[PDB]
Amino acid sequence: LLDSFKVDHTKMNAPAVRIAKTMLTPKGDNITVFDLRFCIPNKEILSPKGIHTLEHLFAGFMRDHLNGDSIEIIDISPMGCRTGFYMSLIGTPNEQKVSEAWLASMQDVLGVQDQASIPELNIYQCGSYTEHSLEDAHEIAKNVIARGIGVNKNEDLSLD
Amino acid sequence: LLDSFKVDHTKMNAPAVRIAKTMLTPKGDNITVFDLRFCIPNKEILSPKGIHTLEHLFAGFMRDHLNGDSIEIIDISPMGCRTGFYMSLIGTPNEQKVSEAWLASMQDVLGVQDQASIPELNIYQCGSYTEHSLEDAHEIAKNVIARGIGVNKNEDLSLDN
Ligand code: MET
Ligand code: MET
Ligand SMILES: [Zn+2]
Ligand SMILES: [Zn+2]
C-alpha cells in the first residue's frame, strides 16, 4: 500500500534525489516529500550512530540552504533502512534545487571539526546523546561529495 | 536552533504523544508534526532492526486509523535517536486522537504473526531488506500497550540555559 513499496529499489541511483510525492492541502497549497537517497539500496547502508549525527547536522544545514519565501521545511528524518532521509516541505522546489542544497550541506558537515563542538549532545537536548559518530558523518559527507548527487524519477522506477 | 533542541528531554514521559509544531501554509491550511515518543529519553532505546520493521508496519497502520476527510498523513519516520517517530500531517488532530490511533496500531503490529508474511521485505521494495526484526517490533508493541500512551506538552518541557 505504502508509496515506497511501488518503486523498484534495484533501479535507484545513489547518492540521488527523488520526488517521492506531491500533495495539495484543502485550500490548494503544495506539499512535497523528497527521498534523499544516500546509499545504493541493499549494497550500502549508513551506521546507526552516523545517521543520527548526520540527522542533527543535516536537518539544520538543509534548512539554512533551503528555507525561504517559497519554501518551508516541515521535517527531515532518517529512513528505517538507513540508506537515506525523507524530507517533507511546503513548496515545490525541483530535484536540482534540493540536490544543490544537499551538496552545500555536506560541505557544512565537513566544516564541523569536533563532536565536542556540537552543543545539543547532552541528556537535556537529545534522546540518545551517546549514540553519535561525527567520524561516520564526515565519511558519509565526503563520499556524497566524491560521488556527486544524481536524480531518480518515479517514471523510471516502475515495478512489474 | 532546531525545535527539538528547545525542549527538556529529562522531563518527557513515554510512551507519549507531543505536538512538536504546527504550521500554516501560505493560504492558511494547517500542518502538524507529532513526536511519538516510544522510549524514555536516554534510559531506553529501540533496536535498529526493530525500529525498521516497526516503521513499515506503523506507517501503514497509522494511516489506516488516522487518514480521513480532514486528516492526511504526509510522512512517518523514525528518529535518529531511535526513541520514537515523527509524524507530519495535513490537519489538526489532538493528542488524544493520535494516541488512540497509535494504541490501535500497536495491536495491529501484534496481529502480524510471521516476518515472512510481510510482502515488501525484498530487494525490490525495501532498501535494506535483511535489516528487520518482527520480534523486536512485537516486543515494542507489547511494551507500549502495557505502559499506555501519555501526553507531553511543550509548556511543561521548558528548558533553561
Ligand atoms: C533535531 S534532529 C531532526 C528533528 C526533526 N526530524 C527535524 O526535522 O527538525
Ligand atoms: C518504508 S515505510 C514508509 C515510510 C515513509 N516515511 C512513509 O511515511 O510512508
Ligand atoms: Zn538526538
Ligand atoms: Zn525498508
Q: Which of A75, A85, A86, A125 to mutate to test the pocket of ligand 1 (most atoms within 8 A of CB)?
A: A75
CATH number of A1-160: 3.30.1360.80
Question: Whole-angstrom Cα distance, residue A65 to residue A104?
Answer: 8
A69/A76 Cα distance (integer angstroms): 19
Question: In 10 A of CB A76, how many CB atoms?
Answer: 24
A8 touches chain B (CB under 8 A): yes
Q: How far apart are CA B55 and CA B32, in angstroms?
A: 19
CB–CB of A64/A73 below 8 Å? no
- Name the CATH topology of B1-161: Gyrase A; domain 2 (3.30.1360)
Per residue, what are the HEC states of B62-87?
A: HHHHHCECCEEEEEEEECCCCCEEEE
Residue B65 annotated as binding site: no
* B35, burial (CB in 10 Å: exposed 0-12, middle 13-18, buried 19+): buried
C-alpha cell at A139: 565519511
Nearest to B50 by CA among B117, B115, B111, B122: B115
Task: List all residues of chain B from 142 to 161 with a beta carbon under 8 Å from chain A.
Answer: 159
Torsion angle (degrees, nearest 10) of CA B121, B126, B130, B135? -60
Residue in A1, A48, A74 closest to B23 by CB: A74
What are all long-range contacts of A118-124, with beta carbons under 8 Å and residues at least 24 apart?
A: A118/A53, A118/A56, A118/A57, A119/B5, A120/A56, A120/B2, A120/B5, A123/B9, A123/B10, A123/B41, A123/B42, A124/B8, A124/B9, A124/B10, A124/B159
Q: Which of A40, A54, A75 to mutate to test the interface with B (most CBs of B within 10 A)?
A: A75
